[PDB]
Amino acid sequence: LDVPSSSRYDHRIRYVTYNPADVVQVDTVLGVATHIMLEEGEQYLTHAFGDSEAYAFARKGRHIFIKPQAELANTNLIVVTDRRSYKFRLQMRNDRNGAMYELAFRYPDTQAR
């Protein structure tokens, strides 16, 4: 389980180091739209939720927004592109605290290249 590490300024914005062998535990709360970005020039192929009506999905280029829409929405998101495949264990938080506004990636292989 890759738990995002938050920024030092506000713990609303978090970063995760991408990994083929692990999933991202996302703590989504009610009433917030959360922002996810891809690599530059990454072509989105398909996405598949465990529950299509539990979350709301709209994608623009390399930017992914997901939104809660139903109580007890605990499913997964598998958004796949040409470069790789993402895995998030979407979990609603009940108390509307410890939110996470935007998730960012740190890529080891690209940085090394």
């Binding site: 739209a33 709301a56 999905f57 709209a58 927004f65 939104k67």
Partner: peptide
């Protein structure tokens, strides 16, 4: 996520007036 008579042909065609419009000084 997001919201939302007429004869005399030759002499009479040489008598057709030439009317040139006047000008105004600018």
């Amino acid at each position: 996520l997001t919201a939302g008579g007429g004869g005399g042909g030759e002499l009479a065609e040489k008598l057709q007036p030439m009317r040139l419009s006047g000008s105004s000084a600018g």
